[PDB]
Structures are given as C-alpha cells and as structure tokens.
Amino acid sequence: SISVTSININGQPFNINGTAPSIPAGRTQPITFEVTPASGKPNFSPGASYTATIYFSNGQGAPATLIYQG
Amino acid sequence: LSGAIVALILVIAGVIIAIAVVLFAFGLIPGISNQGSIQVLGSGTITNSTASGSSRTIYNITITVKNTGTTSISVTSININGQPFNINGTAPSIPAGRTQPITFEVTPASGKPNFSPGASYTATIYFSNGQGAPATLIYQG
Amino acid sequence: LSGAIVALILVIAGVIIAIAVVLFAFGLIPGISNQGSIQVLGSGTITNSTASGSSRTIYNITITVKNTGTTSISVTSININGQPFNINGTAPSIPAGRTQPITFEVTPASGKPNFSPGASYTATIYFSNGQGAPATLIYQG
Amino acid sequence: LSGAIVALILVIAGVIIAIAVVLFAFGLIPGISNQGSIQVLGSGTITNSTASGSSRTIYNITITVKNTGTTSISVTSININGQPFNINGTAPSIPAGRTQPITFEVTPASGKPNFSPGASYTATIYFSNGQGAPATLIYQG
Amino acid sequence: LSGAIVALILVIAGVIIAIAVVLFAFGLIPGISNQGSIQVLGSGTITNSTASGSSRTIYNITITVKNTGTTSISVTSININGQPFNINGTAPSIPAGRTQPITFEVTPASGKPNFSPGASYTATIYFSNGQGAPATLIYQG
Amino acid sequence: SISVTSININGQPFNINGTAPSIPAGRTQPITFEVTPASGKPNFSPGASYTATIYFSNGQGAPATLIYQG
Amino acid sequence: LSGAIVALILVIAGVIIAIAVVLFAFGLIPGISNQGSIQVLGSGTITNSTASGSSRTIYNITITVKNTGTTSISVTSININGQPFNINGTAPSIPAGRTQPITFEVTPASGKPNFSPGASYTATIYFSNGQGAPATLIYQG
Numbered sequence A, F: 001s002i003s004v005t006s007i008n009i010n011g012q013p014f015n016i017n018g019t020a021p022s023i024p025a026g027r028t029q030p031i032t033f034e035v036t037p038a039s040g041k042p043n044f045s046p047g048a049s050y051t052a053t054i055y056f057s058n059g060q061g062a063p064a065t066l067i068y069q070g
Numbered sequence B, C, D, E, G: 001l002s003g004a005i006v007a008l009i010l011v012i013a014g015v016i017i018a019i020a021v022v023l024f025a026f027g028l029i030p031g032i033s034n035q036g037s038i039q040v041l042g043s044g045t046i047t048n049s050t051a052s053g054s055s056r057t058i059y060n061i062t063i064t065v066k067n068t069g070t071t072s073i074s075v076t077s078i079n080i081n082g083q084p085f086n087i088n089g090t091a092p093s094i095p096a097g098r099t100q101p102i103t104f105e106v107t108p109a110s111g112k113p114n115f116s117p118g119a120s121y122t123a124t125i126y127f128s129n130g131q132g133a134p135a136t137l138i139y140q141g
C-alpha cells in the first residue's frame, strides 16, 4: 500500500489537506483528496488543463493532466 | 560489485519513468477537446459608449457566442482591424451548453481606432479556453 | 598473497552479479514490450438511456472496437467533451484479436452534459492497459 | 583484507548515488510545465517612437499576452523578420493568470529595419520562463 | 580490478541490448508502413431493398471500389447522412489490386433514415484496415 | 551453434512443440519452429504485429516483431 | 587498495564520456542540414532534343537550381510524372552556393511517353544528397 505525499500543479506546490489517501496493492481506484496552495494562489480557468506531478511515499512521482471543473 | 547494483536501480527506474511518460501522453488527450468549445455566430456590433468629454474612448462589443463545452467560458481579449483592445471591467462569461448575445466594454491599447458608421471590421475574439474565433463587427456610431 | 586472492574473488563475483543484472534486463523485455492495443474504429454514438424522471442521467455509448493484443481488455473510464464519466454497472471486456461493437452505459461524474442531437463530440476511452484512444461520438437523442 | 572492505564502501555508496539520481529525475518533472505558460493573442503593432533627429531608432511593440502560469513573466528578447532586437529600458512583465496588452520599446541590434506602413511582420517573442512564441506585428508608421 | 571488469561487462551488454532494440525498431517498419488503401471511385447508390412490409428496413448499397493494397480487405460499417448502419449478412471482401462494383445490404443501427429519391448523401465506409473513405451515395428509390 | 530455449509472444509464455531449432556459428539464416500457447487461448488477427522475445542458449533474449499470416 | 583508485578513474572517465557523447549529439546537427541543400525554383522546361528520326527519343530538362550546401551536388536520377527516366549524358553538377540554370539530356527508362505542347508535367529530381525536389516542367517541343 502506497500513499500520496505532495502534488505540484501548473508549477506551484500544494499541500495535502488532512490525511493523504493510501492506494492498496495491485488495485485500481479513483482517489480523491483535498489540497491547498503551499504559497501564493493559483489562477485556474474553468475547462483548462493543467500539468501536475503527484509524488508518492515511494519518492516516485507521476506526471498527470488535471482539468479544472470550477 | 558496485556497477551492477547501480545498473539494476537505473534499469528499474527507467521502466517506471518511461511507463509514467507514456501514461501522461494518453492522459493529455481529454484536455485537447476544450480548445474547440466556442463559436461566434453572425455579425456583432460595436457602439461608442463613452460619456461626453470623457478622457477614455470606450466601445461596446455585442456578439452572439455559442458554448458547446461543459464549463463556463469568458472573453479574455479582442483584436479589431489588427489593433489589440483592453477589456474593461469584468470579462463576460457564457454558460456551459448555451447560446447568448454577449456584451462587453473595450478600450484601445494601441493608438486610437477611427471607426466609421456602418463600416465592417474583422475582429478576432479570444476566450478563456485558449481559443480564438474570427468575427465581423459592424460599427453603429 | 591475500590482496590478489581477494581481487580475484571480487573479479569473479563482479562477473557473476553483472551477468545476473544483464540476464534480468533481458528478462524485463517481454513484460515492457507487448505490442498491439485497443483500436477504435469509425464513429460511435451517444444515446439518452435515462427513463421515468430518474435522479441520475444515464447514456448509452456504442462504438466499434478492435483488440489487436493477445489478452482480453476492458474499458475503465470515458471522458466526453472534456467532462469525465463513470461506467455504470460492469464494464465490457473485449476478447483478444477480435472486432466488436461494444455498448456500455455511462453517467456524468460531476456536473451534467449539454449534448445536442446530431452533434459530434470528441471522447477518450481508457482501457485496462492504461492506454486511451481518442474517438468521435455522435449524439443521437 | 583491504579489497573487500573497499568494495563494501563502494557498493553502499553506489546504491545511495543511484537512488539520489532516480529521485532527481522524478524531481525535475514540475519544472517542465512552466515552459508553456505564455501565449500571444492576435496581431500586435509596431510604431516608430523615437524623437525627431535622434541618433537611435526606437520602436514600440504592443501585443496581447496571456499568462496561464502561477508566476509573473517578462519579455526578454524579440526577433522580427529575422533581425534580433535589443529591448530598451525595463522589460515589461505580465502577472500570473492575467491576459493583458503589453507594451515595450525595442531598438535593432543587427543593421536597421525598413518597416513599411501597414506591412505585416512575423516576430518571435521570448519570455523569462524560457519560452518563445510566434507573433504577427503590423507596422503602423 | 573488479570495478573495471564490471564496467566493461556493462559496456558490452549495453551495446548488445541497444543494438537489439535498434534491430527491433527496423523490424517494426514493415508492419506499420503498408501503403495503399481501399479507394472509393465516383458516386454510389442507395436503393430500398425492403419487401412485403418487413419489420426492418433494408437498403442496397452499390459502389465502385479499388483495392490498391496487397491483401483482401472487407467493409465493416457504413455511416450515411450522420446515421450508423449495420451490414446485413456477410460483408463483401475486395481482392488485392482489383477494381470492382461491390454491393451490400444495410439496416439502420438505431432510428430510421429519411432518404429522398434523387438526393445525394455523404457516407463514410469503414474497412477492415480501420481506414475509412468518404463517399457520395445517390438514393434511387 | 546456439539454440532457441524458450519464446514469449506479446508478454504470454509459449512452448516450442518440436525439438529446438539451432543456428550454426557465423551463419545468417531463416529459422522456423512450431510453437503452442503455454496457458489460456490467444487469438492472433491477420496482418497484426506481435512482439516475440526469443531466448537463446546464451540466456540472451532478442525482441522481434512477428506479423500474423493465418 | 586498488578498488577505490579504479572507482575514481571510472567516475572521472564517466564525466568525460558523458560530456563527449553530449557534444557528439550536437556535432551531427550542422551535418544533417545538408539533406536540404538543393532548391528547385521557377517552372522548368522539357524539350524534344533527338534528331533525324533516331531510335531514341531524348529530351531537354532545363531547370533553375539553387545549391545552399558547401559541396558541389549532382543530379543522380529523375522521375517525370511518376515514370522513371535515365539521364543520357554525364550528370549535371551545381557548385556550392550557386543559383543557376541546369540543363541535361534524358530518356524514358521504360515504355514510350508522349508529351503535349504547353502541358505541365511534374519531375522529381533526385540529387546526390538523396534529396528529392518536385518541379513543374512545361513541354515545348
């Protein structure tokens, strides 16, 4: 089982609010988690797509695309 | 001994980063769709809207916009006749799935325009989804 | 004497561990390099499945799909017109080497869509491979 | 004895440096995003801005720029028609998340341009995030 | 001594595995790069095949088709006037290098068409290649 | 002289039916051998490309593309 | 004792070889540009050049060619309107940096073509770069 530890979105660092989700071994899931900007504030536009990097307890990170819904 | 142990770490890391980059390339694809959400319907109008003797020329751009996307989208800039214009006050937005006459105030950023009553100007309107749309605007006076 | 016998042990052990890591690198190749994919053929269709004033809107999605791999693979998500959708019920599994029209039901994950009868929407279907395919779906009504 | 003790140190150091390099490769990834922050909207304008009889030709470049990034970004250079230009005074900056008509003074670094009234010049604008953007500029006189 | 012999093994094994991947890349070329296609020549025709008040409407489709590839290829779907149709019975297979009038029967997949005698409909035929061809069909009655 | 010891097609294990084919020293040649799926039931499609990794008596594995004909 | 000295030499040599490989990667770039040294510009002409009812029809291929490379470059082969053709004489060659008319005699490689006065035919001329340039020849004879 491995958990998220940080996310960076559109270049900006974010902190996970509350307990970070843990993903069980061998499993596919939609995870959901809350985040706050670490410093500054973002300028997300409805329907725009942002490159993000999620970092896991492995130290491994994954590039991702997130679409801002509103 | 060291070299083989190092090569093993870098092989496994190579597989992990390569797969993550391939998944990212598949993961981009949904974002591309939204670049086409807006289209501009018919001729719009430009109208001189400033008060008498005011320091700033301010015009009024009315256009029908259609939003085929799943999110609200806003006008971010307009280029008229080759001139960039600044958008005054709050940008207008068009709701998801709707078609509406949209109205906004603009002021010229380069020089001053010399619009002629009943003359037809090609604009390009730019929207918050990162899209440009060609438009025709008729100056009303 | 000692230094030379130890140097020889570490030469021999170096050969052994280096060859073990080289054989491991050859052993990765089958897992990382499976060719072939789910291919999506022609346009699909979206149809309103929602009935009897139900609280959740459900859509049929029908599309022709060709599995060119050697294993059965299933749909896992679809994104349509930028919006994410969940598969309702059990997702369809496409047998190895086979071409089929698949049909599956979907609900919007959040918000709601604004499909127009006869309009064409870009969609991305994601399979159990993590591979996705861009597709065009025409909304039927 | 010595050889085995040395090999042990170099094995453990090998693991540590290899892991640190793998973590660095994952740690680079957020920096790549920022290379796409800017885009240039519509035609800009060039205007001759120098005073009568002055030794230096100085032009005025007005363009709409959109910053989708999370930080302020500034214009660092412009190349017009294939000529490099120097940027005079302070570089302009566009705030995080905003779309603005941006204006700056430039002077030619190679030879002199011979801009023609109403003629259209392809430029490339370069920004402090390390990004180039193609632009069209119309010379106003 | 050990470190250098291990470095040399990993140089040699690196050459071997790199050349193996380069030879694999050359080995992909024939499968990914088959030239030539089904070409659709002139207009086709749609004719009402439905008889005796049958519950399902069936249409003849006749069109001239030229296979410029080296393998026999079959139709798999047609879309006409935006609407999907299923091939009834066994789909026709077009021999390599050959020009033929093919004829096949089709039924609407969902809904029903509104063909007008003498009107021309844009259609897309999809072949076993996954390749499709736009076509014009004239409805005969 | 070096022989095919095992083959994996598109990630799946496969068994050489007959005796193993063997290629003499210094030779370049066509090599042909009969093979069966080791587990399950694959289904190849005409003109589609499948990777095979062929493993030789060196322990060496070579990736190859096979195009299905049948 | 030796293991550390060997590790140091291979660390230092690793830096040298990695930098050398990076420099080699750039050093290819001016080289590969020569792949596009030739431009064929304007319309060319093709003219009957044979005499006295001789057994070979021979033609006049005149084109204007610009060589941007640092070596003299020659016509290796020509294909006219899809058909193979053989240069009768020795190949024409265009010096480095020159723009000039180039003229050469050519014969059909197979069959018997028949050009019509004032009609336009494509030729692709293949140069000693392996580069092919399409050109239009107008027939004169």
Ligand SMILES: *[C@@H]1O[C@H](CO)[C@@H](O[C@@H]2O[C@H](CO[C@H]3O[C@H](CO)[C@@H](O)[C@H](O)[C@@H]3O)[C@@H](O)[C@H](O)[C@H]2NC(C)=O)[C@H](O)[C@H]1NC(C)=O
Residues within 6 Å of the ligand: A017, A018, A019, A034
């Ligand atoms: C970040 O994580 C906190 C837990 O790590 C979480 O605390 C919990 O808060 C909920 C209720 O929170 C509501 O009210 C607060 C004001 O008190 C708002 O800031 C917040 O946004 C919510 O509207 C409470 O039921 C629960 O017991 C708390 N848990 C713990 C362990 O303290 C924060 O709420 C969360 N921050 C946000 C903004 O959601």
Ligand SMILES: *[C@@H]1O[C@H](CO)[C@@H](O[C@@H]2O[C@H](CO[C@H]3O[C@H](CO)[C@@H](O)[C@H](O)[C@@H]3O)[C@@H](O)[C@H](O)[C@H]2NC(C)=O)[C@H](O)[C@H]1NC(C)=O
Residues within 6 Å of the ligand: A042, A043, A044, A045
């Ligand atoms: C997400 O929701 C937040 C709460 O509604 C909102 O923050 C509030 O924003 C207003 C002013 O910010 C303006 O700019 C943002 C740009 O994203 C607009 O979305 C928003 O409509 C306003 O025009 C501020 O006065 C108020 O104090 C904020 N409240 C909080 C909770 O901080 C965010 O703006 C909104 N979007 C983003 C990208 O975070």
Ligand SMILES: *[C@@H]1O[C@H](CO)[C@@H](O[C@@H]2O[C@H](CO[C@H]3O[C@H](CO)[C@@H](O)[C@H](O)[C@@H]3O)[C@@H](O)[C@H](O)[C@H]2NC(C)=O)[C@H](O)[C@H]1NC(C)=O
Residues within 6 Å of the ligand: B048, B049, B060, B061, B062, B101, B102, B103, B104
């Ligand atoms: C920019 O032009 C807009 C288009 O006319 C306008 O907003 C619109 O308002 C009109 C109605 O305007 C009349 O009626 C109001 C009373 O309801 C009076 O205040 C005013 O004097 C008018 O003659 C409406 O029909 C239209 O739909 C609105 N906009 C849209 C969505 O098209 C603005 O007033 C104008 N602004 C300036 C400063 O010129």
Ligand SMILES: *[C@@H]1O[C@H](CO)[C@@H](O[C@@H]2O[C@H](CO[C@H]3O[C@H](CO)[C@@H](O)[C@H](O)[C@@H]3O)[C@@H](O)[C@H](O)[C@H]2NC(C)=O)[C@H](O)[C@H]1NC(C)=O
Residues within 6 Å of the ligand: B048, B050, B051, B052, B053, B057, B113, B114, B115
């Ligand atoms: C928008 O309306 C303004 C008045 O509501 C008007 O200002 C007046 O301008 C006139 C003269 O207009 C000419 O000269 C100006 C420069 O002075 C040009 O920009 C303009 O295109 C005309 O060629 C002036 O006599 C008067 O004092 C101004 N004020 C009032 C109360 O009348 C703007 O000129 C007008 N702009 C456009 C484009 O029509």
Ligand SMILES: *[C@@H]1O[C@H](CO)[C@@H](O[C@@H]2O[C@H](CO[C@H]3O[C@H](CO)[C@@H](O)[C@H](O)[C@@H]3O)[C@@H](O)[C@H](O)[C@H]2NC(C)=O)[C@H](O)[C@H]1NC(C)=O
Residues within 6 Å of the ligand: B108, B109, B110, B111, D048, D049, D060, D061, D062, D101, D102, D103, D104
């Ligand atoms: C480079 O061009 C700029 C674009 O015009 C300009 O800055 C802009 O200033 C204009 C307003 O200029 C007029 O009004 C001021 C009085 O407010 C007078 O000083 C001047 O004589 C003008 O006719 C403004 O509309 C525009 O938004 C500004 N820039 C932007 C962000 O677009 C500079 O003045 C000019 N510099 C030179 C040396 O040419």
Ligand SMILES: *[C@@H]1O[C@H](CO)[C@@H](O[C@@H]2O[C@H](CO[C@H]3O[C@H](CO)[C@@H](O)[C@H](O)[C@@H]3O)[C@@H](O)[C@H](O)[C@H]2NC(C)=O)[C@H](O)[C@H]1NC(C)=O
Residues within 6 Å of the ligand: C047, C048, C049, C060, C103, C104, C105
């Ligand atoms: C989406 O695909 C479903 C199968 O995956 C399909 O279910 C089948 O429904 C048919 C009957 O469907 C008719 O009636 C419904 C209303 O009940 C209409 O919405 C529909 O358009 C048809 O007119 C039934 O015979 C069959 O046994 C069902 N099979 C399964 C596996 O459920 C849905 O009908 C289909 N939805 C639409 C709108 O086509």
Ligand SMILES: *[C@@H]1O[C@H](CO)[C@@H](O[C@@H]2O[C@H](CO[C@H]3O[C@H](CO)[C@@H](O)[C@H](O)[C@@H]3O)[C@@H](O)[C@H](O)[C@H]2NC(C)=O)[C@H](O)[C@H]1NC(C)=O
Residues within 6 Å of the ligand: C048, C050, C051, C052, C053, C054, C055, C056, C057, C113, C114, C115, C116
């Ligand atoms: C698919 O069918 C759904 C069931 O009939 C329908 O949802 C119902 O819609 C009405 C009002 O939504 C309106 O807007 C949609 C736009 O798509 C129109 O198609 C529809 O005619 C109405 O004008 C709502 O009152 C009712 O509660 C909904 N019922 C459910 C099951 O949610 C959808 O609207 C329809 N289309 C789409 C795109 O999902």
Ligand SMILES: *[C@@H]1O[C@H](CO)[C@@H](O[C@@H]2O[C@H](CO[C@H]3O[C@H](CO)[C@@H](O)[C@H](O)[C@@H]3O)[C@@H](O)[C@H](O)[C@H]2NC(C)=O)[C@H](O)[C@H]1NC(C)=O
Residues within 6 Å of the ligand: C054, C058, C088, C089, C090, C105
């Ligand atoms: C989403 O998938 C569910 C299975 O994963 C499926 O449950 C099955 O439902 C059918 C009958 O469903 C009808 O009635 C319900 C209300 O109870 C409606 O919401 C629904 O739309 C249908 O009209 C039942 O025969 C079957 O046993 C259920 N299977 C299981 C495993 O529970 C849901 O119906 C499906 N949602 C929709 C909207 O189709």
Ligand SMILES: *[C@@H]1O[C@H](CO)[C@@H](O[C@@H]2O[C@H](CO[C@H]3O[C@H](CO)[C@@H](O)[C@H](O)[C@@H]3O)[C@@H](O)[C@H](O)[C@H]2NC(C)=O)[C@H](O)[C@H]1NC(C)=O
Residues within 6 Å of the ligand: D048, D050, D051, D052, D053, D057, D113, D114, D115
């Ligand atoms: C920008 O404006 C300057 C004046 O504000 C102008 O300087 C004048 O130039 C004219 C003649 O211009 C021609 O010749 C010059 C070389 O002398 C060329 O660079 C230019 O493109 C024209 O072909 C001269 O008679 C006069 O004395 C100068 N000064 C004034 C006060 O008029 C610049 O030439 C002008 N640059 C451009 C590109 O328009």
Ligand SMILES: *[C@@H]1O[C@H](CO)[C@@H](O[C@@H]2O[C@H](CO[C@H]3O[C@H](CO)[C@@H](O)[C@H](O)[C@@H]3O)[C@@H](O)[C@H](O)[C@H]2NC(C)=O)[C@H](O)[C@H]1NC(C)=O
Residues within 6 Å of the ligand: D108, D109, D110, D111
């Ligand atoms: C190599 O090209 C350089 C680029 O032009 C040039 O240095 C530049 O000098 C120009 C200005 O040159 C003009 O003005 C000076 C008077 O100030 C005259 O001496 C001369 O005749 C010119 O027409 C300057 O704009 C530019 O910024 C300088 N260089 C840079 C940093 O771009 C050199 O003169 C030239 N050298 C040779 C031998 O060709």
Ligand SMILES: *[C@@H]1O[C@H](CO)[C@@H](O[C@@H]2O[C@H](CO[C@H]3O[C@H](CO)[C@@H](O)[C@H](O)[C@@H]3O)[C@@H](O)[C@H](O)[C@H]2NC(C)=O)[C@H](O)[C@H]1NC(C)=O
Residues within 6 Å of the ligand: E047, E048, E049, E060, E103, E104, E105
């Ligand atoms: C669509 O193509 C069919 C062949 O793929 C063809 O079947 C042949 O039919 C002919 C006789 O057709 C005549 O009679 C039917 C009514 O029975 C009319 O609909 C039709 O227009 C003709 O007047 C028969 O001799 C032949 O053996 C059949 N061959 C096969 C392979 O079935 C259909 O007739 C054709 N439909 C139409 C409307 O032309």
Ligand SMILES: *[C@@H]1O[C@H](CO)[C@@H](O[C@@H]2O[C@H](CO[C@H]3O[C@H](CO)[C@@H](O)[C@H](O)[C@@H]3O)[C@@H](O)[C@H](O)[C@H]2NC(C)=O)[C@H](O)[C@H]1NC(C)=O
Residues within 6 Å of the ligand: E054, E058, E088, E089, E090, E105
């Ligand atoms: C769609 O394809 C079927 C074969 O895939 C074909 O079945 C054949 O049918 C013919 C005779 O069909 C006639 O009668 C049926 C009613 O039984 C009508 O629906 C049909 O339109 C024809 O008038 C038969 O000789 C042959 O043996 C069948 N072949 C097989 C393999 O079953 C269907 O007829 C065909 N549908 C239509 C509408 O033509």
Ligand SMILES: *[C@@H]1O[C@H](CO)[C@@H](O[C@@H]2O[C@H](CO[C@H]3O[C@H](CO)[C@@H](O)[C@H](O)[C@@H]3O)[C@@H](O)[C@H](O)[C@H]2NC(C)=O)[C@H](O)[C@H]1NC(C)=O
Residues within 6 Å of the ligand: F017, F018, F019
């Ligand atoms: C799978 O491998 C077997 C050995 O590697 C091979 O055995 C050889 O068989 C041939 C003759 O086989 C025929 O008869 C058998 C029944 O006994 C059939 O199953 C088969 O299809 C053939 O028709 C024999 O001459 C030879 O000596 C055998 N070799 C050895 C080493 O014993 C099988 O033939 C092979 N399977 C197939 C289907 O070829």
Ligand SMILES: *[C@@H]1O[C@H](CO)[C@@H](O[C@@H]2O[C@H](CO[C@H]3O[C@H](CO)[C@@H](O)[C@H](O)[C@@H]3O)[C@@H](O)[C@H](O)[C@H]2NC(C)=O)[C@H](O)[C@H]1NC(C)=O
Residues within 6 Å of the ligand: F018, F032, F033, F034
């Ligand atoms: C697939 O491989 C089978 C053996 O690996 C082979 O069966 C053996 O067939 C040969 C017949 O000799 C011919 O083999 C093929 C065509 O059959 C040609 O490439 C070749 O030049 C010869 O003409 C037979 O002698 C032998 O006993 C069979 N079995 C063994 C154990 O050797 C199949 O023929 C082959 N099929 C295809 C389509 O390639």
Ligand SMILES: *[C@@H]1O[C@H](CO)[C@@H](O[C@@H]2O[C@H](CO[C@H]3O[C@H](CO)[C@@H](O)[C@H](O)[C@@H]3O)[C@@H](O)[C@H](O)[C@H]2NC(C)=O)[C@H](O)[C@H]1NC(C)=O
Residues within 6 Å of the ligand: G058, G088, G089, G090
């Ligand atoms: C086709 O190419 C030949 C070499 O590229 C070229 O040979 C040259 O010939 C000229 C003189 O040729 C005359 O005489 C011959 C008979 O021997 C006739 O066929 C021809 O039409 C001319 O009348 C000679 O000076 C030169 O040295 C030769 N070059 C070489 C490299 O040997 C042929 O002339 C050419 N065909 C034609 C029709 O010109």
Ligand SMILES: *[C@@H]1O[C@H](CO)[C@@H](O[C@@H]2O[C@H](CO[C@H]3O[C@H](CO)[C@@H](O)[C@H](O)[C@@H]3O)[C@@H](O)[C@H](O)[C@H]2NC(C)=O)[C@H](O)[C@H]1NC(C)=O
Residues within 6 Å of the ligand: G047, G049, G059, G060, G089, G103, G104, G105
């Ligand atoms: C077609 O090209 C032939 C050679 O490629 C050429 O024959 C050679 O002719 C020249 C004569 O010199 C003249 O060439 C043409 C007109 O004849 C003019 O463009 C050019 O300016 C010269 O006036 C002769 O010296 C030479 O020996 C011939 N052969 C070779 C191998 O060079 C034809 O003249 C030419 N025909 C046409 C109509 O362009």
